[PDB]
Structures are given as structure tokens and as C-alpha cells.
């Protein structure tokens, strides 16, 4: 590991973050499906927890709360970032309304339903169609009846 970093293409400072990025809204859309019911991807929920807890800490550190308060808040912030990048990696995963674990940021790449596995499954092409087949003996070897 030390040699791996010794090549020094990237410093070890990357292991600790000072600013997390947010994916564009389209990849986590907020659509209003037919019926007046709003639908959102779990990424929005996880980001809200991170942003809200961070803002509270910014307010709380300015106020001047005792040491225990700030320490607890930073613990909440670290936990929220932990859940964002991987939910269920540690501890009991954050659950949804039906006790369903939220699909964290790394859950888009892992498992059967991930970007890499989905690429294996194949992409749904256009200009196509399917139908039943029936033997036709009046065709030549290089023909097919549509």
C-alpha cells in the first residue's frame, strides 16, 4: 500500500474529504407521475440529510455550543456521509417508509441491479420486433417471410 502511494501520482490526502459532490439532478430525477403523486430517487433523501446536518453544524459552531454538542454533530455528519456513499456498509442501513433500505450512491454500481451488471444485461435497441415463427418450405435458403 505504501509503495502504491509512493508512486505519488495522487497524495494520500484524498482519503479525507472537504467537499462532497452532488450528481446532476437528471440522474436522480424528481418526477410527478400521473395521479398527482410525487416520486423521487433515494439520492435526494440522502443528500438532504448531509446538507441539513452540515448547515446545522455551521450554525452550531458559530453559536459556540459546548464540546459535546459539536462532537455529536460532527459524528452525525460523518455518519450521513457514510450512508450517502454506501448504505448498509456499516451498521443498520437507513430504511425507507416500508423498512426498505435506501439505494445509496454506490448501490448504482454494485449487485445485480448496477451500472456494470446492467451493461452486461444489454441495452434495449430500436428498429426491432418479435413474433411467432412458422416453418415455410417455399422459401430459398436466403429468405425469410415477414
Amino acid at each position: 500500500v505504501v509503495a502504491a502511494f509512493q508512486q505519488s501520482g495522487n497524495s494520500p490526502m484524498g482519503m479525507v474529504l472537504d467537499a462532497v459532490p452532488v450528481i446532476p439532478p437528471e440522474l436522480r430525477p424528481m418526477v410527478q407521475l400521473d395521479g398527482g403523486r410525487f416520486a423521487t430517487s433515494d439520492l435526494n433523501d440522502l443528500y438532504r440529510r448531509v446538507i441539513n446536518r452540515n448547515n446545522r453544524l455551521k450554525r452550531l459552531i458559530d453559536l459556540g455550543a459546548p464540546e459535546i454538542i459539536v462532537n455529536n454533530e460532527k459524528r452525525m455528519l460523518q455518519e450521513s456521509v457514510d450512508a450517502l456513499f454506501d448504505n448498509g456498509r456499516r451498521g443498520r442501513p437507513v430504511t425507507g417508509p416500508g423498512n426498505r433500505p435506501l439505494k445509496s450512491l454506490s448501490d448504482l454500481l454494485k449487485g445485480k441491479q448496477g451500472r456494470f451488471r446492467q451493461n452486461l444485461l444489454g441495452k434495449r435497441v430500436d428498429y426491432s420486433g418479435r413474433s411467432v415463427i412458422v416453418v415455410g418450405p417455399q422459401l430459398k435458403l436466403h429468405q425469410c417471410g415477414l
Binding site: R115, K123, V125, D126, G129, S131, V135
Partner: protein, 1126 residues
């Protein structure tokens, strides 16, 4: 002997008299529910079965729960005596109005007030309980739902054992499985550290737990002095002492807690003696008592495990490990010592509708009593009344969830009456509380010698759910505990007896079971000295006729309902019969139904019990009959009218009709069939037609399982079917305004709106096609941005703003046909619509589908096929009398598949159609000695029956084929071998050799071509992935998986693969450019970068992983790019 009066007398080849009539086929479903609600009929039936104090389902769930305390004993609540009320509305009303067939449930709760002493009791509404219609289907939310029985491991003790490989020493392990609680695996190891593993915790020697139970060292030694391994383990244990033992148990079970003696005792009692935390149902207690022979005489009580059972278990384990064959626990009778198998149907119980609902009610009551306990311990005590205590939200929520989401509450498939009947008889194995697909090892999907008479081995889904789904046999019955019984008739002394006794798997092993086909003298004496028998464990071997103890009832005992109506099933293979059974449930009802010429006796009973046909309740004379209703005048002077539905859409689309068969002024006896539902003729199931089959390869048009059909079937509506589609749209109030269905739509010609009525919904009888407007719906867009130029145009013409959009219901692509009927639910008239909607109209459009290329046909023997060609009538080969064969089947698929039964069916079909006259002047020919005396002469178009496993023999068919009556011209067409000389339809010269001909019963499966046709030049795309998809507006693309990608790579086709993935699937700018290039003459441009990759890159960067697409010179390429076309 026809039980139903108005039966069509079909002479049958049966040679063995059946002593027991088929039981009510759907009683598996109805009896369970009758037990649940404590109906009077169930209690009356339980009186005969031999139960002194039977208790209903609800009467048990809310009786055991009561009384509920308040942790102090100063307040207690008890409820009992549950009673129902008359259903709110009949089934038909709840089906038309999209209501839920239910009845309100009232229970009598009483509050005691231990401190003061005064009591208060009154009835408490508990909710509208979904009741079960007479046919065993729940009408939930307007859709007939059927809950399939479930197979689950029986709670009890299973003395499992395993053999070590490295040591070659036997390791036994008993595994107590309760209904709810902990596991007590007493496994023995090669180390001899026989130990407990409570909750799969770290193994601890059993001596520790036994001492923690308080057993003294002297008592243990004296009792177990006959077990060497027990003594060695006792002398090898390290921890000793009851207080030390329980503390160790407390630490092991809940480590990190204060190790106090009182705490350990609470855990011990809470784990073994608490009647709520640890519990096994009455069935579990019965199994444990029978296995260990403890309290055998005592009736089932005190469900919770008792310590005397645990010590008996440890004695059983050690005694088995010694090798003893029998053991006797003191205070109980002796029982055999042997290993046990789960798959054995003695250990797999059946939880019918009553059990499933009861558990859901139990969970609901468990939640309710939690709330009432909290309220009781917190609410005021002076003026507390049960109404304010009892809550009904959790119970109603629980029951609704079960019928709305549970995997065991499935949409009753109503393809035909047989499909409905078989669905009720299903025995699902997967689902909540049962083994999943992945966890289901291959060992459980196999057949077991205990399935004989309890669960059909032939019928089961061919897909992945193979072996996890079965079906009750014809005669199978479910005992109150849940074990599936099966009738047998005992033999007192080598002589068969009339009276029967129902035996379960456990009682079968001890006794000896004969076989039905074994010959028996008229007086019951066994003619043979030895008879084939089924011994304890799947072993069959001859035995002396005196040793036999039980005999089957009929040879058809092992086959399900679907499999029981495949003639000559005794000649097919298991694979084909399995496909034959699973395709009779896919047939589609035709316009006009014809009873099969050759079919088993199960045809009639299956139709009567399926509920499709209406059967007269009491004898009477029909005063007036009409196409809509028939009224029967009873003998008591009371009138009754049988309203029968016409052209009503089933669940799966096929239509349902009930055309009366009786005539005015005709006497009808009670129980007779009055009208024929779908797939029925004169009251006997008829899923298809009779077609004159010729078995020969014809010009390759029937190559490799394809089929060739005469044009007679298309033009004479032989195989024409009706299908009903339902389209529905609703008007909901939006933020901008209220949506309204109206005849006026923006900028549409009057011709497109010609067929719309005044209300704005197409008028009945209007022929629609793919795209026409069914419902004129306009939605408001008033509070929407308006372009400055656009509202200027509005003012210029004075044109109405007309912001309202037009989301008007339209026929999805591929649908057509008349509009049989429309229903409109309006909140203005208080029709109980869902919250947020005002107008809800559903339009039914009916299309009459004929048979064309691509449709699937199939016989009863699993001989599938697809209509390769439909030749004109003159092209079909015709018999010497000008009759053209109506279908042709390839002969290369008959012997290889090994379903010779269909050939036999064809032969007997022709003999039944032509009619025969056995030569009787010189006496009965030797081959006809066994034929019933009334089967020696049959008229043309006669109907015959060959019951499964007992029917026409090979000698009999050969005899009949040589005795068929001549044609009206005076010539016999088919020769003695069943072959006939056909004339070629095209060439016109006779085929060189004779060919087989006869009538085979051909159904019409529901895998029609019209459903399976898709095409997509361009259509709607997704939102997150930007890939093709469309809901019948454009059919949607076809997946191009990885395996197809490998094929393209193997060819070396690099350009074609790039197009299939980049230009026409994801590359958005590519898709637009290519469609503009194709429409014009320009060459298709070069593809771009797939949207899938860019999404992957922009989502890999979000995890704080710097990803760069380097180029030559090690310089990053800025993937972001923007160019404005035009």
C-alpha cells in the same frame, strides 16, 4: 349410476366398480373457511368426526389472547363469542360496483375492573370481514381472488442424523421446531460434546442446560445409567452447579448483562414455559406427543414446551445413538426409535384458507392488544369503557393488506372453468413462511412415495416453479390438524370390505396397502395368492393375500383433476402428460362448444363443481325460459329466477356466457344443470372441438411440430373465439382546475368525433380501431405560461384561450371491435369513487378472433403446435367419400416423444364417430368377453368414456376397429388397422400407401399470435437511462443482451454492433440525426458516445474518483461538448 339426473349417458369401458364417489372437488377451500367463521355446518360435521369440544378459527384467536392484563392485575379485558351478520350486498352487486363482498363482525368484550369490581360488557364492531362466496372465491375490491393453500414444515421434533466422512461416525441431531420461539438443536459431535445451540449460539454441552433445569446429579446418573456415552460426557463436563449453569446460560444467551440468578430464571421461564413468547400450535403438540409418546392419552393442551419433553428428547437422542430400535419413556407408551424425513407427507402439513387468515388476524389482534394495553396503563381508570379501549385500525389494516398484497392471494385465473377449479386446488410451496426458490434445494422438488393419493405427481408447472406447486388428488381430504388424508377400504381377513377409513401418511406406514387393479372375486376373495403391494417406505413386493391390511378405492386415486381427464393416460410418458395437464388449463372458450367424443368420466363432475354452470336448487317445472333468465316453479309454490350473465369479461380477457339448455314446460330435478357456462356442453367440460386428423408428413408445411388446418375451420367458425378488452379513464381534480369529460376537443375534425356521443364517450355498437377516441377528456392548462405571440394570436382572431389540453382515452395500438358496453361511475350520484376523482368511465370493446397462422393448438396428450398453414378445403387430402381431413399432424413427432396415447385416442375416436356393431350372432367374440353387455352396439356420433388407468385395452380397440358400421354409401372407409386410402388434394392421385385417420380432440391454447406481435421504428424513450420504451403507443424495443453481442463479435461485425448499441439505443443526437438522414436521402452519419458511458462517468466521479479519458500524449479529453445544429 349417474349422480346428476340430467347427465348425457356416455357408455364407459370401466371394468372395476368404484365404491366411493368423488368428493366435492372444491371442499378443500370451503371447509377451511367454514371452520374459520365457526359456521353451524362445520360444527355439525365436527360432531361426526369425533371432536367433543370443537372450536372455530376466530373463537380460538381471540379466546387464547384473552384475558389481557395491565401488568398489575387491577384491570383486565376479555372478549369472546364472535358473530357475523348478513352480507352487505350480494356477489353480483359487489362485482359490478367494485365493492368488497364482506360481512361485519361483532364480538362481546367485557371489562372487569378488579379493584372496584363493577363490570361493563357490550358488543364491539370489529370490521367488515371479507366473506367467501359459494364457489370458494374472495371478491376483494371487485376482483375474484383465490388464496392457494400452502405447504409448510410441521412444527415438532425431527431426529435428523448425518454420517461423518473423515471419521465415518454417525452424528445425530434433533432440532425442535416450534411455531414461534427459539431453536434447541441437541447435536452430538465426534468430540462427544453433546451440546445445546439455543438460537444458534455457541455450542454448550447439554449437561449444563440440564443442570440449569435443576436436575440433580444422582437423578441424572440413575436415569441415564444405561447410556455409556451419557456417563462419559457427564464425567467429562467441566462446568457444574445449577446456579453456575443458569448463569452461564444467561451469559451465553444475553452476554454483557448483569449475571443475576433471578434474571436467568426469568429468561428460562420466558423461553420454555411462557405461553406467548414460545408457542407451538395444537398440531405441533400432537406431533411431539406422538413422536415421544408423552401424555398420549391427554388431550391437546398447554402448547408451550414442557421440561418432561426435553428430557424425553435427550433420552431419545442418546438411545438412538446407542442403536436401540425401541424405547419407552416412563409414564408413556413405547415408541419406535428411527430417523425422520421432512419431505415425508407425515411431516409436511397443509394450512388452508382458515389457517392463513387466522394468522393474519392473530397479528392484527397482537398489535391491537398492544395498543389497548398502552391505553389501559395510561388512560383514566374511573370512566374507561371498552369502546374507548378496543381499536379496530390494526385489524382492518392487517386483513386488507393480506388480501391486497400477500403472495397467497392471487388473481383467480378464469381462462376456462378447469383453470379456475385447478387454481383453488393448488398446493403452493413457496411464499412467506415457506422455502424460497433459491433456498429450495433439488431434494424438495422431487417426488416421494408418500404423494400417492395426497398430491398428484404429474401436474405441476413446467417452468422454474417445478415441484414447488402441485394439486390435491381427486379423493384427497384434509384432516383438521392439516395433514392430507386419503381414503382406503380395509380388509378384515383377506376379503375386501365396503366401508372405508381415511388414513394419513403416519398411519399408512404401519399398515400394508394393496392396489386397486388387483383382481378380486365377486365375494371379495383375492383370486391370486400374492398381490402387488406398497410397503413401508416406497417398497413394493408381493405378499401373501392374508397379510394385506388396506386396499385402494379406485385406480384414479393418484391423479389430479386436470390429469384425470386425459384419455389413455396409461400410455403416455410423465413429461407429455405433464404438458397435457398444464395445457388444458390454457384452453380458450370458443363460440360453440362440443363435448369430446372420447373422454374420461371426470368431464361431467369437474364442470358441475367448477361453478360455471347454474344448477337448479330444487325440483320444479320451468314456467318460462329466456336468453337472459330462467324461472323454475318449485313444488312448494315458491318462484325462483336464475339470472345468468351474458358476454361478461373474465379476469384474463376471455368471455363468459351461460345459454340455457332446458325448455319451457320441462320438469327438472334438483341438482340438474340448467345452463352451460363457457367451455361446457350439456353440463360436461368441453374445452375444444373434434377434428378429422390424418397423421402423415405433408409437403413440409407441418415440419417439426407445426400444424396444417383445413379452411373449413376458419369459414365455419369451428375454432372462433371472443375476447373482451376493458379500457378505463378517470377525471380527477387538478391544482389548475377540474378535469371534465366532454365532446369538445381543441382542433379536431368532426369526422374523428363522429362516433362520440353527447356525453363525450363513444356510443354502444360503434366499431373502433387502433387510434380512435373512446372518451373525450379535456384537462385544464389555464395557469400555464402563455407565449406573448400566442396570446396575441388569441386576441387577433378572438380565438378562445382554450388552455385545456386533451388527454383523451384512445384505443391502444392493435385493438378493435365493437363496443359491447360502457359503465360510468360519477361522484355526483355518490358512487363511492376513489378520493380525488369525479368521473370514471370504463369502456368494454369486444373482438371476435378467428384462427390464423401463429395460433397454438394442442391435443390432450401434450402434442403442441403452431398453425403453419391454412390450406383451402380442396387442397386437403380427402377420404374416398369426399370428406376432406380437417387437420394434419406430422408422424415424426409421435414415436420420438413417446405419447402413443394420441394414436389410440384417434382410433377410438373414429370408432366412436362411425358407430360399431359387434358380431353377436355367434356369441361374444373372445376379445369382447370383458366388454359391458351394453357396449356391444353404438350409434354414429356416440360418446364413449375410458377412465384413466382402467379403460379400453389394446385387444378391445383392435376388435372395435374391425366392427365399425359402414358409411351411408355402404362402404367401410378405414380398414382393420385403422388406416385409410387418401386422395391427394393437388395431384389428385391416391397416396401409394394407406394413412391413419380419425377424430382427435383439439383445443385452442391462449398463446395467440395477435398478442405476440411488436414493431418499433421510433417511439417514446426513458427518462433516467434514455432507452426505448412505450406502453402500446410504440411497442418498445427488444433487448440486445450480452449473448447477442458475443455473436456479433464472433462474426467480426464491428460496424453493425456499434449501430445496435450507440446510434439507435442511447446516442441522443445520433438518434435525431439518423432519423433525419433516413427520411431524407443523406447517408446515415457516424455514431457518437453512448449516453450509458457518460452516465457511468458522471456517476463514478460523484464517489470522489477522478476519472479522465486520456488521449495520445497523456492529455485528458474534455468529454463535455456542445454544438448547435442549424
Amino acid at each position: 349410476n349417474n349422480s346428476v339426473p340430467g347427465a348425457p349417458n356416455r357408455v364407459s369401458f370401466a371394468k372395476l366398480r368404484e365404491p366411493l364417489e368423488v368428493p366435492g372437488l372444491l371442499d378443500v377451500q370451503t371447509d377451511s373457511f367454514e371452520w374459520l367463521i365457526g359456521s353451524p355446518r362445520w360444527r355439525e360435521s365436527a360432531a361426526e368426526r369425533g371432536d367433543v369440544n370443537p372450536v372455530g378459527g376466530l373463537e380460538e384467536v381471540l379466546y387464547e389472547l384473552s384475558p389481557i392484563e395491565d401488568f398489575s392485575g387491577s384491570m383486565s379485558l376479555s372478549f369472546s363469542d364472535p358473530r357475523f351478520d348478513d352480507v352487505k350486498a350480494p356477489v353480483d352487486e359487489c362485482k359490478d360496483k367494485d365493492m368488497t363482498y364482506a360481512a361485519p363482525l361483532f364480538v362481546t368484550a367485557e371489562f372487569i375492573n378488579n379493584n372496584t369490581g363493577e363490570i361493563k360488557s357490550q358488543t364491539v364492531f370489529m370490521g367488515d370481514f371479507p366473506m367467501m362466496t359459494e364457489k370458494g372465491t374472495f371478491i376483494i375490491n371487485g376482483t375474484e381472488r383465490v388464496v392457494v393453500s400452502q405447504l409448510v414444515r410441521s412444527p415438532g421434533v425431527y431426529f435428523d442424523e448425518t454420517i461423518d466422512k473423515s471419521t465415518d461416525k454417525t452424528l445425530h441431531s434433533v432440532k425442535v421446531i416450534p411455531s414461534r420461539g427459539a431453536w434447541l438443536e441437541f447435536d452430538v459431535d465426534k468430540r462427544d460434546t453433546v451440546g445445546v445451540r439455543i438460537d444458534r449460539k455457541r455450542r454448550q454441552p447439554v449437561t449444563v442446560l440440564l443442570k440449569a433445569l435443576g436436575w440433580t446429579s444422582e437423578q441424572i446418573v440413575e436415569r441415564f445409567g444405561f447410556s455409556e456415552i451419557m456417563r462419559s460426557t457427564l464425567e467429562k463436563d467441566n462446568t457444574v452447579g445449577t446456579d453456575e449453569a443458569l448463569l452461564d446460560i444467561y451469559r451465553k444467551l444475553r452476554p454483557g448483562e448483569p449475571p443475576t440468578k433471578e434474571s436467568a430464571q426469568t429468561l428460562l421461564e420466558n423461553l420454555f414455559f411462557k405461553e406467548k413468547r414460545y408457542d407451538l400450535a395444537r398440531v405441533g403438540r400432537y406431533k411431539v406427543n406422538k413422536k415421544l409418546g408423552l401424555h398420549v392419552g391427554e388431550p391437546i393442551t398447554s402448547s408451550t414446551l414442557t421440561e418432561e419433553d426435553v428430557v424425553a428428547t435427550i433420552e431419545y437422542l442418546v438411545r438412538l445413538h446407542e442403536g436401540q430400535t425401541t424405547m419407552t419413556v416412563p409414564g408413556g407408551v413405547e415408541v419406535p426409535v428411527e430417523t425422520d424425513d421432512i419431505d415425508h407427507f407425515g411431516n409436511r402439513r397443509l394450512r388452508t384458507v382458515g389457517e392463513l387468515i387466522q394468522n393474519q388476524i392473530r397479528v392484527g389482534m397482537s398489535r391491537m392488544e398492544r395498543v389497548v394495553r398502552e391505553r389501559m396503563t395510561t388512560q383514566d381508570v374511573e370512566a374507561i369503557t371498552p369502546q374507548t379501549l378496543i381499536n379496530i385500525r390494526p385489524v382492518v389494516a392487517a386483513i386488507k393488506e393480506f388480501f391486497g398484497t400477500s403472495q397467497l392471494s392471487q388473481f383467480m385465473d378464469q381462462n376456462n372453468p378447469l383453470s379456475g377449479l385447478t387454481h383453488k386446488r393448488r398446493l403452493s410451496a413457496l411464499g412467506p413462511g415457506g422455502l424460497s426458490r433459491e433456498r429450495a434445494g433439488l431434494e424438495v422438488r422431487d417426488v416421494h412415495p408418500s404423494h400417492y393419493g395426497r398430491m398428484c405427481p404429474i401436474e405441476t408447472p413446467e417452468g422454474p416453479n417445478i415441484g414447488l406447486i402441485g394439486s390435491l388428488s381427486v379423493y384427497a381430504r384434509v384432516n383438521p390438524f392439516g395433514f392430507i388424508e386419503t381414503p382406503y377400504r380395509k380388509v378384515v381377513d383377506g376379503v375386501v370390505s365396503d366401508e372405508i377409513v381415511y388414513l394419513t401418511a403416519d398411519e399408512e406406514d404401519r399398515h400394508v396397502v394393496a392396489q386397486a387393479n388387483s383382481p378380486i372375486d365377486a365375494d371379495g376373495r383375492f383370486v391370486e395368492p400374492r398381490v402387488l403391494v406398497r410397503r413401508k417406505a416406497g417398497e413394493v413386493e408381493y405378499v401373501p393375500s392374508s397379510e394385506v391390511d388396506y386396499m385402494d378405492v379406485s385406480p384414479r386415486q393418484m391423479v389430479s383433476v386436470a390429469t384425470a381427464m386425459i384419455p389413455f393416460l396409461e400410455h403416455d410418458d410423465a413429461n407429455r402428460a405433464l404438458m397435457g395437464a398444464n395445457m388444458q388449463r390454457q384452453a380458450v372458450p370458443l363460440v360453440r362448444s362440443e363435448a369430446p367424443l372420447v373422454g374420461t368420466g371426470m368431464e361431467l363432475r369437474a364442470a358441475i363443481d367448477a361453478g360455471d354452470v347454474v344448477v337448479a336448487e330444487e325440483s320444479g317445472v320451468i314456467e318460462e325460459v329466456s336468453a337472459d333468465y330462467i324461472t323454475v316453479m318449485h313444488d312448494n309454490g315458491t318462484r325462483r329466477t336464475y339470472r345468468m350473465r351474458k358476454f361478461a369479461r373474465s379476469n384474463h380477457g376471455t368471455c363468459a356466457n351461460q345459454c340455457p339448455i332446458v325448455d319451457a314446460g320441462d320438469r327438472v330435478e334438483a341438482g340438474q344443470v340448467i345452463a352451460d357456462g363457457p367451455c361446457t356442453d350439456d353440463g360436461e367440460m368441453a374445452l375444444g372441438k373434434n377434428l378429422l386428423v390424418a397423421i402423415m408428413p405433408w409437403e413440409g408445411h407441418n415440419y417439426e411440430d407445426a400444424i396444417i388446418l383445413s379452411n373449413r375451420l376458419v369459414e365455419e367458425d369451428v375454432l372462433t373465439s371472443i375476447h373482451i378488452e376493458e379500457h378505463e379513464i378517470d377525471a380527477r381534480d387538478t391544482k389548475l382546475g377540474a378535469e371534465e369529460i366532454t365532446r369538445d376537443i381543441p382542433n379536431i375534425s368532426d369526422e374523428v368525433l363522429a362516433d362520440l356521443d353527447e356525453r363525450g364517450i363513444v356510443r354502444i355498437g360503434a366499431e373502433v380501431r387502433d387510434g380512435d377516441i373512446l372518451v373525450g377528456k379535456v384537462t385544464p392548462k389555464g395557469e400555464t405560461e402563455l407565449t406573448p405571440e400566442e396570446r396575441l394570436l388569441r386576441a387577433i382572431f378572438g380565438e378562445k384561450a382554450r388552455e385545456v389540453r386533451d388527454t383523451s382515452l384512445k384505443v391502444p395500438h392493435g385493438e378493435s371491435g365493437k363496443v359491447i358496453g360502457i359503465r360510468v361511475f360519477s361522484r355526483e350520484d355518490e358512487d363511492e369513487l376513489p378520493a380525488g376523482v369525479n368521473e370514471l368511465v370504463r369502456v368494454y370493446v369486444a373482438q371476435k378472433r378467428k384462427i390464423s397462422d401463429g395460433d397454438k393448438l394442442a391435443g390432450r396428450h401434450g402434442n403442441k403446435g403452431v398453425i403453419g398453414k391454412i390450406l383451402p378445403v380442396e387442397d386437403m387430402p380427402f377420404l374416398a367419400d369426399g370428406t376432406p381431413v380437417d387437420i394434419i399432424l406430422n408422424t415424426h413427432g409421435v414415436p420420438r416423444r413417446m405419447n402413443i396415447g394420441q394414436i389410440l385416442e384417434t382410433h377410438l375416436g373414429w370408432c366412436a364417430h362411425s358407430g360399431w356393431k359387434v358380431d353377436a350372432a355367434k356369441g361374444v367374440p373372445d376379445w369382447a368377453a370383458r366388454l359391458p353387455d351394453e357396449l356391444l352396439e353404438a350409434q354414429p356420433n356416440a360418446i364413449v368414456s375410458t377412465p384413466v388407468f382402467d379403460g379400453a385395452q389394446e385387444a378391445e380397440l383392435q376388435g372395435l376397429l374391425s366392427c365399425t358400421l359402414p358409411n351411408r354409401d355402404g362402404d367401410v372407409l378405414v380398414d382393420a388397422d385403422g388406416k385409410a386410402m387418401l386422395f391427394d388434394g393437388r395431384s389428385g392421385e391416391p397416396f401409394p400407401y394407406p394413412v391413419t385417420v380419425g377424430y382427435m380432440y383439439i383445443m385452442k391454447l391462449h398463446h395467440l399470435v395477435d398478442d405476440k406481435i411488436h414493431a418499433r421504428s421510433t417511439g417514446p424513450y426513458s427518462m433516467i437511462t434514455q432507452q426505448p420504451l412505450g406502453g402500446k403507443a410504440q411497442f418498445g424495443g427488444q433487448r440486445f443482451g450480452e449473448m447477442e453481442c458475443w455473436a456479433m463479435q464472433a462474426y467480426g461485425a464491428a460496424y453493425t454492433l456499434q449501430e445496435l448499441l450507440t446510434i439507435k439505443s442511447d446516442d441522443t443526437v445520433g438518434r435525431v440525426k439518423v432519423y433525419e438522414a433516413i427520411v431524407k436521402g443523406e447517408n446515415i452519419p457516424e455514431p457518437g458516445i453512448p449516453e450509458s458511458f457518460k452516465v457511468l462517468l458522471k456517476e463514478l466521479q460523484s464517489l470522489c474518483l477522478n476519472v479522465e479519458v486520456l488521449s495520445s500524449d497523456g492529455a485528458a479529453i474534455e468529454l463535455r461538448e456542445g454544438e448547435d445544429e442549424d
